[model samples]
Target chain A: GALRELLEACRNGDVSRVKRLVDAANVNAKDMAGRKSSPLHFAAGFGRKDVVEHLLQMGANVHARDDGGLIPLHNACSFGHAEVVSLLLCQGADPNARDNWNYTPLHEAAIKGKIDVCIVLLQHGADPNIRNTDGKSALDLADPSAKAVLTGEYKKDELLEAARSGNEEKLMALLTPLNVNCHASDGRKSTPLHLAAGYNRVRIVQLLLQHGADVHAKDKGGLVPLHNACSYGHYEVTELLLKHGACVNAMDLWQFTPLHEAASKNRVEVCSLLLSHGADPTLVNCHGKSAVDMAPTPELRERLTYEFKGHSLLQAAREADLAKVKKTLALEIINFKQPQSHETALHCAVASLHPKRKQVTELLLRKGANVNEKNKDFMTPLHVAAERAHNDVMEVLHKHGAKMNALDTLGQTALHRAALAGHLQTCRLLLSYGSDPSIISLQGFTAAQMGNEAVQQILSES
Target chain B: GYRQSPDGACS
Candidate 1:
């Protein structure tokens, strides 16, 4: 009770109560229920500099930890309590002490945008470059101004500043006699070329190139000049870099190609430029998703899809383009499967709910497309049609020898899917095709249990 | 002089 009362008083900045409590109780007494932090942690965290002084004078443990391993100084710096930070540092607080996230007090100050606290901690010799679990330093978490202050690049290098500010004349003057390939990384290894390309400084880019700056120079993330150009959708800069022998398919540390970045952001013009220059579309990222798979818009996806193998037939089926389907089949591209999902044209047709889907299904079947082709999920065309309640598609598939009782990877039959979708006609059709309603799924649910009352009644009556 | 915690909390 005494410890709880002291912690509460400290939190509220009640200096009098804290003094009275500290005189009577153990000044370093910890929270009994939680992280076991001393009263000083609360006072420091809430900016009670007076209480913090009293506790420190009365012999409070400044290095006491809470549940998350936060010390009083971490609490003080993280909350931007400048005076308390000054007191803690004056009393010999370890400036470089780490928290649970491996963040130093300076890191906390930087992340919280506490400029004064950060300056105090850094004055006490806090390591500004200490990296967190994410490999980001305190400067990385800081705002641009804070980052500049932390890296002491408040005044950038002459060439870098000129490039970033798009001052071609100044940049040209600075670049005239220097090594064109001179490294101007601003603590993060971002060269002047990276800055020029990132800021869309086309003239500066040309200047850097004329001086023979390495077009393939990478930053900390392994992103080259072309990657930065593509990420910001600077088409002219991108084209310029590509002509300068920048690798169009250069991958970042995460295996993100320039095309992947463009696709994710729907940069159609950049994507087209990269593609025309031979960027690999089939290259999968670390997540196994190709650039086309990462396209955010249907239109962008359609553009990328044309480059994917077997997409012509699958796209035609997905759009229910009868004319395109006829043309694709005439080109002998029937039954071709999409590489990623292993889905055939028939699978695409059945999965679609397009107005002309029935026609697509009929055409695929007539062209000898496998009606029972299973995709990666082991789900057949019949399984897709039944689940989506596409009765017409189901009817077409059933007439062409699609399996009614075919079980997918989940061990559920087309009847189970139809019943669960509450499609009375599909249920009736599957049953008429001799679909066994008594079959139980891997989850042990029968068609009668999975379906609606009508499906239940039909199964019960049969 | 107070020492920061191993994780950088000012103790």
Candidate 2:
């Protein structure tokens, strides 16, 4: 535990604690149980630039290796600590330092998808093409769209710049598959299609596509041309892209669909057009907000939400997943029928048994579930409630205006179901709801007449 | 280019 507080202080970037603990000789001391970890390695991983600078001033070995042959440079690169990476590089920490796996500092940053760290390492001359002992380069261990593409940089395409600047004549002169789809070696690594779509050069877009442009070509940032088109609020261009088979729900880096872009940008025309093409407003992005959440207007939210939010509601209600019910009500919808059953979610909610069944029913009704909606068998939710003998749900429905006397296809009301099934509590509650105990079935049976031996007395007395 | 030194200092 010698100088253990120093390592922790280094990790915390606590300059005062480090200054009190560290000196020139002990700066290189590895904590006995800390995998040969030195103060520099600890400080670098946490981006402790202050403590790192202090350690350097105290003559800490800039190139000291930990137990597994990892340096402070590798630690900072692995954590994407850009400032710390730059500081280490300037202080002469070798960017090419390889750990036990023959993993360079750049390889460490690359595997973790740390873009900024990779950039700093490159600027400091970490070889982009350097391979690990496994024969994989830093680029090989990285995500599908990372600095490997960023490093190739965009080679200037004649047609791309023409498309970007909307030069029709030059575009006609330069159009080819390479010119059409090749991404620019520029900042965004965007394709000609991406540029044309964003700028709404509809004619240029048509020409590019006509020349065999890959519509699904994703840029370095994971954006397709459709994302660019929709995000820039180009309605006709968006429509044109969609007409040519652009994916309406094409997701980007953040799982942001085109609908998310349209809703965020207040492009109501694009939103509606996308919705018409089956863009799901309920599709939540990586940020946990659906396109419905980003919708600028309540009318837009309702327009986006009302139709498909039904199924999410139906499944949750049927499973008696009350937490799902509350979230769905707050952020989803009700009144949706499971098409095969043709009954609303409310029917399923009422038919299920849970300690929170009453609360679930209350949530569904409060969210405007049709209390009288009939299933294929012509049984309302109230009828399902009676059949299940769920008296708690019965109260919630009655307060929400569910008709107790509502009849099924058999021409029997809920009271008829309860009375016939001999559920005494269900019969008593049904009667208290002012149900017509005299309502007859198609076979000329009243509640007391059709009721079981136990239920008949209650109906007859009531 | 025929040989390498004993460079174990990866850090």
Candidate 3:
């Protein structure tokens, strides 16, 4: 390693003596110990211009860096030594050359907001949009909240138009003369009125309307600006558009009415407003699904059925809400006895494993829902519940004396279900309740083999 | 057979 005297001479810029010592070999001549950085690295970083030139003339590598990838130029630029930077660049140093982390000298300047350094790098052909591996460009590294003048891209007319329209200026000033018509469509085929309506900027919509923006201007997919207004439950905008004679019955690309959008989001005030405004209740979409068809909740379904004069339960329930058998029964909505798929509400409830399964099944039973009712597959509710290991529901059905040994189309008993699911407790309960363990399924699989270790142990002990 | 006894609180 070089001793302190020689190292201090290079650091202190004793250039003449340092070069004499190097020529006579009186001073130890070696690279920096840990990182192999020559004296040029320290000279450049410390802005020792004469020492840097001396070291370079002494055949010390000018481009050498420490383990941190900080070359002499990188250090000079980072330390803001403009003269040292000029000297390094005069020696053919790369201005935009990135270090290990893809941070160029320009990036360092931009992050520090050194505008003069920035101007120098730009004059030297530094890429303004060069992104690091993390996707941060030099421009993005600049202050986001800085005045738009810094970016050189902000248009004053657009800003003024937006402000004037939103702030209720009675008459807009002709500060910068430009045609508003040439810049109308925003890719969704939506005019500025659509944006104003959708954003609930009522005064902006009024300004656009006063300027003769078509109140009925439909977007690319045939969605009127009013549909956009109602979709967000923008009640004031909706009212404004309606007052301006906007089409109340306009449908979107999905063929959804304004009421459908309002009802689905549970916007009670919007729904009431639309209903009062003569919005149709029976308007079906392209799927032949009406507003009532989208009611996935109890409250929504009730509103559709009782208040909206919409689709009847038997009609809608040919497809949905079969698990609310109690509510369906109390309403006496459908004929449970005239079974579809030879299955009643009891079978449907058991197969569903409904969260309120007991109440559903009990309601079905009270309304003469047949306990022993079988499906087209000849499987009972007990068979369905047991196979799925629906333990609580199965127990309730078993207590109701559902046939334990009843066979389905496959000739499998409810015990086969218990065994299939490895339900030891349910199997034990069924067996103690006189379900036959010796019964074999159509596949010739016995309950013993079907049961897992726990059920196997329980059966062996029994 | 494994011996059956009360599974006492070991913690």
Candidate 4:
């Protein structure tokens, strides 16, 4: 565990012995564990100013890297040891020297918020605009909020404030005349518009847009200005982008439309704005779900349905529209089910609005509608009520002796479908009415997979 | 899974 005596002497800043050791052999001898470092690397890392001077005096290679490409100056700058970095630079150390990934000492200092180290490096002619592997300079690595940190320079906040204030005079003075690219970003693909939107600078957004900034530019995440506004819940920004022709139907990398993101966050106004701009109501994402399907609440579904299906009484009946049920039945043109699905009018009525279940079921039964009629999906009106957990509807159908064991094309009995909907009461009622509890659906799913514990227990007992 | 060369270079 002991370092070689010569290595230990140089690390310990023994100037007399270090000069003698270098005269005899290579003073920058490396160890296996210190593959990317030498004695000078350790001295700089620990901020031993005297040791650094001793190594440099003995002709120790300040730029020497053992294995991993890191040098002594990188350690000194990153650790914020201003005196050690100043000493190295005074001894002819390269100020803009970088390691493997081209990260100069200045870049590391800025990223660490070591303002003192940065000032010392820059004083030695370190390049502020020198890019790293990611093409970000020292100024770009500084945190966006560092403006208020008061760490030696006002450049970060100065540029942002100029943009936010829309002082075209100051902005032009700082950027155009100075040749600072207004299009420059922080390597996260955030242009000036992204920063403005994130900071809620609506005026700045307008300013940037008017100055011919790319309005549709996407960030690293493929997020445009509208996407940023929606994510931050910025109503004014959202409206501004919409007014300026931001894509209402633009999908991000996840294939999520702006409407999808807005609705998921309950941004009612944004959703309305998107709808009014002719956003497609029927657009399905990769998941095969439309906006109506993704709406978390019934109110959104109702709003969408009114826009897309305002005239289909047949749809109303299919939706179990109670008002249409009464009106259509009054006109004597009422069928128990939609013609295509063969779902009786009672099925439609129950699905739309749960009202007068017993009366409606009896009327449909008396009218000779098949209580057990299987539709396209092989679901009877009872199956619909059971699958959706409409307990009252299930009660009415069972009262008329609807078959409990009737299987659809899937061979799933009413009890099986009831369990799939997790309808405890409907499952219990079906079991009490002599439904087969032991049978599985065509998919081999038992009632246990569909119903609650009580319903599963009843099925288990049988 | 895509295979790489023995020296970990992309094949």
Candidate 5:
């Protein structure tokens, strides 16, 4: 029980008692009834700084990993023992020592909100960007105090404020392409692009956008920079944001679109610009007012009420009206999903029976409709094509990189849909695209493998 | 008793 006594004294910070039971031979011995922890692990966890110093001075290993593969420094940092942590770090402990889950001492410190411990680890060259097995950095898992320390090490707020005040030179000095998406730690949690666009700092926004900033960076309001720019009547900022791929139809906390803001403000030019860019006027806000309902003038109301953007394109595809689609649809609205069904125009076009269905389907594809977008039933456009036994439409979808093995809500691939419906040509076409035969469905075995003599009757018996 | 009429798959 000498080693057990040694551990007890080490945890209790009894220097004289530890010195009596511990020696050069037993100083590193782990006999604490099967966790296999040395005296240093016990000492470090309880902030027994003096006992830790005595154990290290008496030749205990500072780099010892317990049975859980944690160094003493990890325990010290995890338990917020700043003194013990500094002692180990000064004793040449590895600053970036990782535990079993790839969490460094800095991660352990930040996880427990140990401000002093985190600062000490960073000062000793621990990497702030080191991620654990969850792909989360210390900053992502940190509480408020530790989060403040981590964000303060870099000029995150400074960079955000530079964009806020339109200070280009300051932003250029502090900004990098990687940190262009770095958001602030302030109450609003605004990204640099959000502040710059909201403030009508066009030049600052141009720099942020050029550095590959997220044009759709959301603030605390869940409002992207496009919403901010449109609300403020910053026409140049709005135009620039759209050019960089900001969604005109993006909704915020209240399901409010940029058009809702512009129309309610009577910013007529902004409303027109957003309409051209496919902002849906029929989309209702949290208060039940659509962008058209928010429109101040009669002319704007009439413009907003043209059956909305997504309706126009999808309705045309449903009717197989190639002329209607060609007259109204643009590349901006090509990938728009119907808010109700979550189905793109391609799904409706492929399932239609008119002679012009193929042409309109090809037109939707030519205009770059999403080939693999899942509708409410989690059915891709190809799923509808295969299940409807439209072989030509299925082939057309395949030509645009439709995933042959994509599963639907039924846990069935397009091939499954084909084979279950006895669409022989559809199955053959899907098989030619290398659709897997062994992909089982939620209901039974694979659709392609379902027709075997024993397998077919297995379901019958069940 | 659950066997089919003649082939014995299901009744």
Candidate 6:
């Protein structure tokens, strides 16, 4: 408790309380709550230079770690506490200490746009070339102003370097009527517009386009400026390129469309934007992977597939348009299992808020839709119906051979969901179907423990 | 892990 009080005092900048508690508590003692931060960490992170100096003099460990492996100097530099950063370095703090993400304090400072903090760290021998888990350096995370500070060079190639550095003013000054579309390559055959779009230079992109920069100019990789923008998930640049009549379905050397790049990177909003601009999701890449196949997340793949299939069946099921649903099912190419969460037509039918949901549920079950099929969450149709307190749907599912004692990924039975929702009538229905009330969830909460008094009493009586 | 300084501690 004395150590905790000292840590709190250090964080609050109360050097007197810290001094009073220093003798009773270990100076290097770490807080057990949350990430274990020492007193020096709190002081340095809160920019308490005096408290930091006092703790250092009392033999506080400068190399102490929080739970995420962040040292005191990391916190100081990350929060732009320049004086604390200077003090820590003077006292032998390692400038290259990396966190769990392999990110140094310089990376955090650059990402936070703290140019002064970055400068202080760089001056004290912080390695600017250290790459994070994503292989991005500190300079890669910096803005134009911070980049200018880091490189100490403002204008070199005037246009290409200005675009790469995101120097909008210098690029504007360099651009003239004759040299607006003057292409310069970094041996990669990439245009200035490509560099601008990749680095999210929205204003510079607009300026280039205004000066008649080629919107469809292809680089060495057969990548246009749109490809660069989509690859980086630059939403504004992608939209601007699309507005300038850049091809949404433009293919690179690998036959990967802009949509393919966006889907592969899980850029959901960018994919949605591209889809709204009439980008074909069905177009296959060189490896024969459609945009859906390239989608990293199930949700993105499902959204793309839903867009591809016109959302006809799923929407009709939600609207209880049994006639439309029957017509779509007649095509026979439609599987009951939807993408993303892998919910079947029966799952959708049961979860529908439509008044005619029961009619659709009966129709799907009679058509041989699996009543016990599990979704991505391993929740069967009955599990969903019971959880949502859809008593009528539950009854239909139970009558049609739905397993009452089926356990989900969380080891939760159908009765478990019902009891957790305090659905007494649904619990009674499940009990009548010989559902086991004695099942315990993975969290070890039984039906009786999760339910209300009435539902617990019913379970006890059963 | 004690180390002797270059100035010789006991000297």
Candidate 1 stretches greater than 4 Å from native = A1-19, A22-307, A330-333, A442-445, B1-11
Instruction: Please list the C-alpha lDDT of all candidates, in the order they appear.
Output: 0.78, 0.78, 0.62, 0.65, 0.80, 0.78
Q: List the TM values for chain B, per candidate.
A: 0.22, 0.23, 0.29, 0.27, 0.25, 0.15
Which candidate model has the greater lDDT, 1 or 5?
5
Docking class of 5: incorrect
Kindly report which residue pairs in candidate 2 clash with one another: A153-A185, A154-A184, A154-A185
A268-363 in candidate 1: lDDT tens per residue? 888867765667777898889999889889888876755443565777788888888887674245766655577889888877867899999998
User: What are the runs in model 5 whose C-alpha is more than 4 Å off?
Assistant: A1-153, A177-179, A185-187, A306-462, B1-11
For model 2, how does the per-residue alpha-carbon lDDT over A1-462 read when each residue is reduced to its tens digit? 648878899988889999999997799998788589889999998999999999999998889988899999999988889999989898999888878878898788878887667666765667767788789988788754444433533224665678878889877544433335676665677787788888888898898787677789887667788888877788878888888899989887778888887788777778767765668887887789999999888887876666445655666686788898877664335665554578788887888766777888888777778888899999988899897798888888888888777888889999888887788999898888888888889989998887778887787775
lDDT of 3 by residue, A278-370 (tens): 566578888887766665566766655543322232222333354533344443333342223655556666666336666655555656555
Order the candidate numbers by TM-score, best to worst. 1, 6, 5, 2, 3, 4
> Alpha-carbon error at A245 in model 6, in Å?
21
Candidate 4 ranges beyond 4 A from true positions: A1-324, A330-332, A336-342, A356-358, A449-454, B1-11
Q: What clash pairs does model 5 have?
A: B3-B11, B4-B10
Any idea what lDDT model 5 has?
0.80
Model 3 bad stretches (over 4 Å): A1-326, A330-356, A370-379, A388-392, A395-401, A408-410, A432-434, A453-462, B1-11
**Which tens-of-lDDT digit does each residue in B1-11 have in candidate 5?**
12111100100
Error of 5 at A408 (Å): 48
- Candidate 6 residue pairs in clash (backbone atoms < 3 Å): none
Higher-lDDT candidate among 2 and 3? 2
Q: Best lDDT goes to which candidate? A: 5
- Lowest lDDT sum, 10 consecutive residues, model 6 chain A, at A330-339
